[PDB]
Design an enzyme around this catalytic site. Structure first.
Site, mmCIF file in Angstrom:
data_model
loop_
_atom_site.group_PDB
_atom_site.id
_atom_site.type_symbol
_atom_site.label_atom_id
_atom_site.label_comp_id
_atom_site.label_asym_id
_atom_site.label_seq_id
_atom_site.Cartn_x
_atom_site.Cartn_y
_atom_site.Cartn_z
ATOM 1 N N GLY A 25 0.772 -1.220 0.000
ATOM 2 C CA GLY A 25 0.000 0.000 0.000
ATOM 3 C C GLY A 25 0.807 1.276 0.000
ATOM 4 N N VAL B 9 3.384 2.144 -1.837
ATOM 5 C CA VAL B 9 4.783 2.125 -2.248
ATOM 6 C C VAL B 9 4.910 2.870 -3.562
ATOM 7 C CG1 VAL B 9 5.148 -0.046 -1.215
ATOM 8 C CG2 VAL B 9 4.489 0.113 -3.551
ATOM 9 N N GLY B 10 3.789 3.120 -4.223
ATOM 10 C CA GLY B 10 3.804 3.898 -5.431
ATOM 11 C C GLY B 10 3.249 3.091 -6.580
ATOM 12 N N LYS B 11 2.472 2.066 -6.273
ATOM 13 C CA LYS B 11 1.845 1.284 -7.324
ATOM 14 C C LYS B 11 1.265 2.202 -8.382
ATOM 15 C CE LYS B 11 -0.725 -1.342 -4.349
ATOM 16 N NZ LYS B 11 -0.176 -1.545 -2.969
ATOM 17 N N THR C 31 1.124 5.364 -9.348
ATOM 18 C CA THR C 31 2.119 6.123 -10.083
ATOM 19 C C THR C 31 2.912 5.364 -11.177
ATOM 20 O OG1 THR C 31 2.650 7.810 -8.528
ATOM 21 C CG2 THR C 31 4.382 6.965 -9.963
ATOM 22 N N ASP D 207 -8.482 -0.996 -7.597
ATOM 23 C CA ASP D 207 -8.381 -0.619 -6.214
ATOM 24 C C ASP D 207 -9.773 -0.152 -5.945
ATOM 25 O OD1 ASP D 207 -8.153 1.975 -4.095
ATOM 26 O OD2 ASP D 207 -6.744 0.288 -3.703
ATOM 27 N N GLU E 276 12.388 -0.392 2.660
ATOM 28 C CA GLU E 276 11.980 -0.362 4.040
ATOM 29 C C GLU E 276 11.387 -1.705 4.396
ATOM 30 O OE1 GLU E 276 8.976 0.066 5.911
ATOM 31 O OE2 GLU E 276 8.089 -1.193 4.318
ATOM 32 N N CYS F 78 24.886 16.633 4.491
ATOM 33 C CA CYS F 78 23.606 16.879 5.125
ATOM 34 C C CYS F 78 23.220 15.642 5.893
ATOM 35 C CB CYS F 78 22.542 17.149 4.084
ATOM 36 S SG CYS F 78 20.965 17.176 4.836
ATOM 37 N N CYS G 111 20.069 13.382 4.876
ATOM 38 C CA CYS G 111 20.171 12.744 3.576
ATOM 39 C C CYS G 111 21.255 11.677 3.572
ATOM 40 C CB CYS G 111 20.454 13.752 2.476
ATOM 41 S SG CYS G 111 19.191 14.973 2.357
HETATM 42 N N1 LIG Z 1 7.628 8.672 11.305
HETATM 43 C C1 LIG Z 1 8.268 7.580 10.798
HETATM 44 N N2 LIG Z 1 9.623 7.577 10.611
HETATM 45 C C2 LIG Z 1 10.284 6.492 10.097
HETATM 46 N N3 LIG Z 1 9.706 5.326 9.721
HETATM 47 C C3 LIG Z 1 8.358 5.217 9.862
HETATM 48 C C4 LIG Z 1 7.528 6.327 10.409
HETATM 49 N N4 LIG Z 1 6.234 5.883 10.408
HETATM 50 C C5 LIG Z 1 6.235 4.619 9.911
HETATM 51 N N5 LIG Z 1 7.505 4.247 9.609
HETATM 52 C C6 LIG Z 1 7.962 2.988 9.029
HETATM 53 O O1 LIG Z 1 7.421 2.956 7.704
HETATM 54 C C7 LIG Z 1 6.501 1.882 7.536
HETATM 55 C C8 LIG Z 1 5.088 2.450 7.534
HETATM 56 O O2 LIG Z 1 4.466 2.310 8.812
HETATM 57 P P1 LIG Z 1 3.088 1.450 9.008
HETATM 58 O O3 LIG Z 1 2.472 1.745 10.388
HETATM 59 O O4 LIG Z 1 3.407 0.004 8.630
HETATM 60 O O5 LIG Z 1 2.086 2.099 7.874
HETATM 61 P P2 LIG Z 1 0.666 1.430 7.438
HETATM 62 O O6 LIG Z 1 0.438 0.319 8.446
HETATM 63 O O7 LIG Z 1 -0.246 2.633 7.582
HETATM 64 O O8 LIG Z 1 0.854 0.869 6.046
HETATM 65 C C9 LIG Z 1 6.810 0.945 8.692
HETATM 66 O O9 LIG Z 1 7.900 0.117 8.259
HETATM 67 C C10 LIG Z 1 7.339 1.846 9.800
HETATM 68 O O10 LIG Z 1 8.373 1.253 10.601
HETATM 69 N N1 LIG Z 2 9.142 8.518 -6.466
HETATM 70 C C1 LIG Z 2 8.257 9.459 -6.082
HETATM 71 N N2 LIG Z 2 8.581 10.757 -5.923
HETATM 72 C C2 LIG Z 2 7.661 11.646 -5.555
HETATM 73 N N3 LIG Z 2 6.385 11.318 -5.298
HETATM 74 C C3 LIG Z 2 5.938 10.052 -5.404
HETATM 75 C C4 LIG Z 2 6.888 9.045 -5.827
HETATM 76 N N4 LIG Z 2 6.236 7.889 -5.874
HETATM 77 C C5 LIG Z 2 4.951 8.118 -5.515
HETATM 78 N N5 LIG Z 2 4.774 9.413 -5.232
HETATM 79 C C6 LIG Z 2 3.497 9.998 -4.775
HETATM 80 O O1 LIG Z 2 3.235 9.505 -3.469
HETATM 81 C C7 LIG Z 2 1.837 9.258 -3.320
HETATM 82 C C8 LIG Z 2 1.513 7.783 -3.335
HETATM 83 O O2 LIG Z 2 1.849 7.172 -4.571
HETATM 84 P P1 LIG Z 2 0.857 6.010 -5.084
HETATM 85 O O3 LIG Z 2 1.303 5.662 -6.486
HETATM 86 O O4 LIG Z 2 -0.537 6.553 -4.890
HETATM 87 O O5 LIG Z 2 0.993 4.690 -4.150
HETATM 88 P P2 LIG Z 2 -0.035 3.399 -4.178
HETATM 89 O O6 LIG Z 2 -0.722 3.482 -5.526
HETATM 90 O O7 LIG Z 2 0.874 2.189 -3.997
HETATM 91 O O8 LIG Z 2 -1.003 3.465 -3.000
HETATM 92 C C9 LIG Z 2 1.240 9.920 -4.498
HETATM 93 O O9 LIG Z 2 1.463 11.291 -4.155
HETATM 94 C C10 LIG Z 2 2.269 9.531 -5.516
HETATM 95 O O10 LIG Z 2 2.109 10.317 -6.701
HETATM 96 MG MG LIG Z 3 -2.965 2.947 -5.625
HETATM 97 ZN ZN LIG Z 4 19.393 16.242 3.987
#
Ligand SMILES: Nc1ncnc2c1ncn2[C@@H]1O[C@H](COP(=O)(O)OP(=O)(O)O)[C@@H](O)[C@H]1O
Ligand SMILES: Nc1ncnc2c1ncn2[C@@H]1O[C@H](COP(=O)(O)OP(=O)(O)O)[C@@H](O)[C@H]1O
Ligand SMILES: [Mg+2]
Ligand SMILES: [Zn+2]
Lengths: 255, 261
Positions: B24, B26-28, B30, B52, B166, B204, B207
């Site tokens: 969910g 990850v950018g599907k 897009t 979806d 991640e 930085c 980063c």
């Molecule tokens: N503020 C944050 N900073 C760094 N990593 C985070 C943060 N929030 C979530 N994560 C990490 O990113 C992922 C997203 O969190 P998660 O609670 O699994 O989202 P969801 O369950 O809504 O898909 C998890 O691997 C978590 O460890």
């Molecule tokens: N590589 C990227 N750089 C900047 N923005 C991104 C990138 N990948 C996704 N996004 C943006 O992040 C959000 C989630 O991407 P999305 O494709 O909707 O994920 P999913 O479809 O897996 O739920 C949207 O704003 C998407 O356009």
């Molecule tokens: Mg989607």
């Molecule tokens: Zn930085």
């Protein structure tokens, strides 16, 4: 403007069902935990319960979890369990029911994305022999629990970016339409650049995010605890890391 | 080691169903777009199809879309549509099955599917193997063993796996690729997405640290899958990726590696 903190949920003892909703990967799970961890500190017992078909309680805690309750390692207080249930919503009703009258004081629910959450609420109104009435009965009860806002709220998780906040909106809104309470928003993964640094990317980003935030605030300032959580370098896993994150939930990271 | 690009998918004309999967957000979505955009450039036509239970094609393109096909604004070529379809899972897949059949008989040359969470695509597969009125169980029967035929045919169907560095994401990509293996369905690409390469010359902490933390993951992905998956790398952009304009650009990188030093 209210505290940017969940303190209030800590304070509201009545609470029985806390629901954490939001968009896939905005960090729902991570909160659910943090929140429990935090309640667990100030309640008799708290059950953390995942319904999401893919369960990440375990992964989050590094700990095998089942449809069987159990103590969370490193606690004596907090429990977690992961299960999976026109009519999928019926198996769900059953779980809450039986659970609800369990010896746990407060439950924090984790689940399949605003989506399922949504269809389900809608349901009751959908239906509008004696087992027909028997089902009816219970749903009806359950629904009322839902509307009673001493017993049930939602927390809204989200991150600053178009598609997430757009859910949090609709969501809050259906929550309104169905007469269910919800007054918190965990805006998560904020990037504050470390002060003293000039760094194009971090600057630019804090910019772009900032923009969203301001909004959130202006919109919801006056009625939602709008909590702000920092995006950490490392995943948030391990009891240890989670306890820590969870602190912020309760007292604002303000750097 | 193969190219870190989807050039192969452009090249593979036989393709009819390209499925984009991953965790969910990850950018599907897009990618689905970007990918269609690019195919659209070198096919007769491409249908971008969302299941979806969400409306994210529209939001991604800023454009109302429906269960009715239609032209994507600013293209003459590419089309997108958004729909939603005694056991449980059974009724459900039945539905989906019927969609594809339906849609496989349109002219569209290639279809890129967007869809409901690993859970859902997963149900689909576990299901078949498992699995003037009634004369009808025969008909479904037929529809599944063909549909499912086309899943097992690697000239017609692959998956692209999306993910970001991640824990939780990659752990899906793994299981997924793996079930895909178990179910005899092809898949050979990975779009690892949202990479942060620090701009060169910038010191930085954050980063740096991050590129560190992500890097670790990547190196892995590579070692494991280098030899058999196009492992595509995409930069994490400042702004959301929306708009035809923005998606076109992004999609480029899909095809020719962002490689900044
Ligand atoms: N503020 C944050 N900073 C760094 N990593 C985070 C943060 N929030 C979530 N994560 C990490 O990113 C992922 C997203 O969190 P998660 O609670 O699994 O989202 P969801 O369950 O809504 O898909 C998890 O691997 C978590 O460890
Ligand atoms: N590589 C990227 N750089 C900047 N923005 C991104 C990138 N990948 C996704 N996004 C943006 O992040 C959000 C989630 O991407 P999305 O494709 O909707 O994920 P999913 O479809 O897996 O739920 C949207 O704003 C998407 O356009
Ligand atoms: Mg989607
Ligand atoms: Zn930085």
């Amino acid at each position: 403007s209210m505290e940017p903190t969940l303190q209030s949920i800590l304070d509201q003892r009545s609470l029985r069902w806390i629901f954490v909703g939001g968009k896939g990967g905005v960090g729902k799970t991570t909160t659910s935990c943090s929140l429990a961890i935090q309640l667990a500190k100030v309640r008799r017992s708290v059950l953390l319960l995942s319904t999401d078909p893919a369960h990440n309680l375990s992964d989050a805690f590094s700990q095998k979890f089942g449809k069987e309750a159990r103590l969370v390692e490193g606690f004596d207080n907090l429990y977690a369990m992961e299960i999976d249930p026109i009519d999928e919503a019926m198996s769900f009703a059953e779980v809450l029911k039986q659970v609800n009258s369990l010896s746990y004081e407060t439950i924090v629910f984790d689940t399949a994305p605003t989506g399922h959450t949504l269809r389900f609420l809608q349901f009751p109104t959908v239906l509008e022999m004696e087992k027909l009435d028997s089902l009816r009965v219970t749903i009806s009860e359950v629904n009322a629990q839902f509307k009673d806002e001493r017993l049930t709220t939602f927390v809204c998780v989200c991150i600053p970016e178009f598609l997430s906040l757009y859910e949090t909106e609709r969501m809050i809104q259906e929550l309104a339409n169905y007469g269910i309470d919800t007054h918190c928003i965990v805006v998560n993964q904020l990037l504050f650049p470390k002060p003293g640094s000039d760094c194009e990317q971090c600057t630019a980003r804090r910019r772009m995010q900032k923009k969203y935030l301001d909004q959130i605030e202006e919109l919801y300032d006056e009625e939602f605890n709008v909590v702000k959580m920092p995006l950490l370098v490392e995943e948030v896993r391990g009891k240890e890391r989670l306890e820590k994150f969870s602190e912020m939930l309760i007292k604002p990271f303000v750097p």
